[PDB]
Amino acid sequence: NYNYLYRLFRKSNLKPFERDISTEIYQAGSTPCNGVEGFNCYFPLQ
């Protein structure tokens, strides 16, 4: 099944017993995020 998916990266570590369901394209670069897929922003949910 391809439905079960995890998080590849985000801003920092998670506080214990905390859930993050955000789908915003994580900005892994100094270039400001354009809100879509590119060379610095990737979809956090892998």
């Binding site: 990266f9 892994a28 670069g29 100094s30």
Partner: protein, 49 residues
């Protein structure tokens, strides 16, 4: 004079600082991959040769 896949330009590089951030903040190359490590933290956790 880029080499071919059968015979590479074997560059054994040694003690120095490799600024992965320089190659990571610039999109001159089409694709950059690094095994299990974000490029930025590549400048913090270091290795031998």
């Amino acid at each position: 004079r880029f080499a071919s896949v059968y015979a590479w330009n074997r560059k054994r590089i040694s003690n120095c600082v490799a600024d992965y951030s320089v190659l990571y903040n610039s999109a001159s190359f089409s694709t950059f991959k690094c095994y299990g490590v974000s490029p930025t933290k590549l400048n913090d956790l270091c290795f031998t040769n």
